[PDB]
Subunit: 154 residues, 4 copies
């Protein structure tokens, strides 16, 4: 069975970001052999004319985080997206694999060790957390970083 990554991001909210930013990240993950669950694409069939669609998206996304093997969370922005953060907290509590992506060079932090709010790293090991922290789309395929180690059992 392929490992399943839930690709959490705010990029579905902007028409241009949805069209241009997500496909390259999806493709980078798929090139490692990962099955990618991207929520904006997976919720295509919900009936958005009905008033309960927001509840139905919430529950579908909760189920996807429960059923994934890891989360790949796009945590660009100041601050990172609140929905992505909820999904990240779910992933941490459910002991999913955690991978963080930030190619935004601004620092937005409450501490000196981590580049973001310390809670985002609570599900990563004390040592080597930066191996799970990706700062460019080109880095996703790196054999030295945590996605590759995960797939190769190292």
């Amino acid at each position: 069975k392929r490992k399943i990554i839930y690709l959490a991001s705010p990029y579905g909210f902007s028409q241009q970001q949805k069209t241009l930013l997500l496909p390259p990240i999806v493709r980078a993950l798929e090139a490692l052999g990962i099955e990618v669950w991207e929520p904006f694409a997976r919720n295509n069939q919900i009936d958005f004319s009905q008033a309960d669609w927001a509840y139905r998206v919430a529950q579908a996304d909760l189920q996807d985080v429960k059923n994934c093997d890891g989360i790949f969370a796009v945590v660009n922005g100041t601050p990172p997206d609140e929905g992505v953060m909820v999904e990240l907290g779910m992933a941490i509590a459910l002991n999913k694999a955690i991978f963080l992506f930030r190619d935004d060079f601004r620092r937005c932090s409450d501490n000196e060790r981590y580049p973001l709010n310390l809670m985002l790293f609570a599900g990563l090991p004390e040592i080597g957390w930066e191996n799970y922290y990706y700062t460019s789309v080109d880095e996703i395929q790196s054999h030295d970083k945590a996605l590759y180690k995960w797939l190769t059992g190292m």
Copy 2:
């Protein structure tokens, strides 16, 4: 034994907000008979002179969310605080009781049903979610709202 509420908020980051905003919320919860776990206060014996303090705070807060009975999440701001959101996601995944506080009247939402990102409500029931959503400090004591129903088994 008293129910334990984890009071998640960004109010510890600002000197004035920590001093003035949190004690009234703490007192409102305590007046219901709740034991309040406030993380900015509870992390007062971490050695902040040591470089790992941020990791030890992260783990301490994760353990507190695992051990609470419910979270009372202050979700003021545009957007809500990313650390609060991680803790909220943890609470949802761990089937804790979920209560939300927002006396910020700005609307910051991706949908028409809820006043915030739909993910924040994923741990609340489809019907009656607003019973868990508090919009003033004065409302916390309300016998018609979910904190009181929780405590009285209704």
Copy 3:
């Protein structure tokens, strides 16, 4: 005639913050002999039941920034409030006196020199901008900081 300070803040958006955080700041400024224009208070005779109230607040605040002598901008939050930032940009372009207030210890910055986005400091001097930068309510009345020196022409 008293110097006029426009007190820009997001604190009017939260019921508790409006009641508890703003009066102490207003009072500290007034103790210096300043006439304080606080926008949430100053627009309390607008009819908020009428559809044009938002345009009338915008124009009232535009006029107040044009007519003030200085702006005292509360730039707490990650990021600072977007309305406060528009008013700050107006003040810079109109050669008003500029004073910044941040008692939030988090860093949210795109550079190493300043704790915030470099644009917020465009109306401050290259050297000694920190004299215009207030990090606690108790510091506002300091005779060593720029607000007091400005009022006394020293």
Copy 4:
């Protein structure tokens, strides 16, 4: 002389956004015959190892807003970017033309008339401000919207 638009955005902060999002917007503006001043590109010839680079960037952007004819502010995100907002306030106070771009469908507002904080619209007319408000890159070239009309 070609009208000058200052293209304010936070897209320069993210490597992928700077590479992918900004060139299409620049090209849409330039297709209208506009001279586009994009701050992340224009700041290139600043020495970023001299300690004062942040101050120099700030002053250079201030001057570009003073010397543009209009601002085209990308106000995506929740909230819109604080540096874009400072530049927008400068443009309002300096009586520059104002155009806003938001293809982010989330609402982030303190009022019922506008989809964002009311201050962002203080430099736009009470009626017809929507004609200055662009919600897709495709819309930038519309002859029914305010940017094209401003060119005549």
